[PDB]
Amino acid sequence: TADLKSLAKRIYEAYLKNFNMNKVKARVILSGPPFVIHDMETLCMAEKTLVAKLVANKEAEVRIFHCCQCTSVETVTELTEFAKAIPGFANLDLNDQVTLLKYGVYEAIFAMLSSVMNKDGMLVAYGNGFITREFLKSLRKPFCDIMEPKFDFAMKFNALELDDSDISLFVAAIICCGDRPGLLNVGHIEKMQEGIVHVLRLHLQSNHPDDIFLFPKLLQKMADLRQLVTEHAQLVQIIKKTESDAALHPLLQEIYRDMY
Ligand SMILES: CCO[C@H](COc1ccc(C(F)(F)F)cc1)CSc1ccc(OCC(=O)O)c(C)c1
């Protein structure tokens, strides 16, 4: 359908406009310049070059965690502007918009994070760094436990070989969940959701004719992400309570407040 075909395009264009990183841009960088962070020496070098103000000191693990949070805060802003392209989102009650973004952002973050991840590491700092998976595993607990579950999800997610046209709709569908707690107008949100999911189903059928189960596979990935986010918040809570030097950005505190 032209109406749905153009809706898919609208979403895709809002995704390209509002997110600094996309899969094509990430694969260009990852093909072959990003500074490689593989040990403590290269981490400290990268900090002096890419986040100089940060180290003009606390444990490396705490500094890394603060850099992680800065990326989240930035992606929240990107996701908030992206949400406007979703038919009906800007028409929802202002409180429902906040609730949908509150519960959706981290699911969206980890879904999109897969695009800059491969089995050896991930792009960081607006594509200018590459931190290795093994270095992250080498951090002292509990900080070494943060990223490995995200790599596990990303390797299987990337095996699906989605492109940005698919991912834009997937992220839209994540935001349009009518079963988020505290929604005022569930019925309108469900209809909004049904509309995005309908476009996603048709788009996957056209864009991925070789994989007839791709749509149900992504439905399951949405459930997987919800559990990934729940477990992530639990680890974040442990760090907040037991790491006196690891403070949470207030915007991210509110997102976690009364989540899981
Ligand atoms: C390490 C994984 O983090 C990536 C960026 O981390 C950086 C590490 C080092 C540097 C620097 F280049 F400055 F050294 C930059 C980013 C961003 S992805 C991310 C996003 C959110 C995360 O959880 C924090 C949160 O709940 O908001 C975590 C643990 C990771």
Residue numbers in the entry: 200 to 231, 237 to 260, 265 to 468
Article sentences:
Due to the fact that seladelpar is a relatively low-affinity PPARα/γ ligand, its cocrystals were obtained by cocrystallization with a delipidized PPARα-LBD or with PPARγ-LBD and SRC1. X-ray diffraction has revealed the monomeric structures for PPARα and PPARγ, as well as the dimeric structure for PPARδ. The electron density maps located a single seladelpar molecule per PPARα/δ/γ-LBD protein monomer. The obtained PPARα/δ/γ-LBD helical structures were identical to those of previously reported active conformations described for lanifibranor above. Seladelpar was found to be located in the similar position of the “Center” and the “Arm II” regions in PPARα/δ/γ-LBD; however, its orientations differed. Likewise, the orientations of the carboxylic group of seladelpar toward the four consensus amino acids in PPARα/δ/γ-LBD were different from those of lanifibranor. The PPARδ-selective agonist seladelpar activated PPARδ with the highest potency (EC50: 20.2 nM) and efficacy (99.3%) compared to PPARα (1.64 µM and 41.0%) and PPARγ (3.53 µM and 58.5%). Some other consensus amino acids, such as Ile272/Cys276/Phe318/Leu321 in PPARα-LBD, Val245/Cys249/Phe291/Leu294 in PPARδ-LBD, and Ile281/Cys285/Tyr327/Leu330 in PPARγ-LBD, were stabilized by all three ligands, whereas some consensus amino acids (i.e., Leu247/Ala250/Val255/Ala333 in PPARα-LBD and Leu255/Glu259/Phe264/Ser342 in PPARγ-LBD) were specifically stabilized by seladelpar and other consensus amino acids (i.e., Leu347/Phe351, Leu320/Phe324 and Leu356/Phe360 in PPARα/δ/γ-LBD, respectively) were stabilized only by lanifibranor. Seladelpar could activate all PPAR subtypes; however, the EC50 values for PPARδ-LBD were ~2 orders lower than those for PPARα/γ-LBD, and this is why seladelpar can be used as a PPARδ-selective agonist in clinical use.
PPARs belong to the nuclear receptor superfamily and the ligand-activated transcription factors; they exist in three subtypes in mammals (namely, PPARα, PPARβ/δ, and PPARγ) with considerable amino acid identity (54–71% in humans). The ligand-bound activated forms of PPARs are stabilized by associations with specific coactivators, thereby enabling the regulation of specific gene expression. The carboxylic groups of the PPAR ligands are known to stabilize the AF-2 helix 12 through hydrogen bonds (red dotted lines) and electrostatic interactions (blue dotted lines) with the four surrounding consensus amino acids: Ser280/Tyr314/His440/Tyr464 in PPARα-LBD, Thr253/His287/His413/Tyr437 in PPARδ-LBD, and Ser289/His323/His449/Tyr473 in PPARγ-LBD. When compared to the LBPs of other nuclear receptors that have 600–1100 Å3 cavities, the LBPs of PPARα/δ/γ have relatively large (1300–1440 Å3) cavities that are able to accept 1–4 ligand molecules.
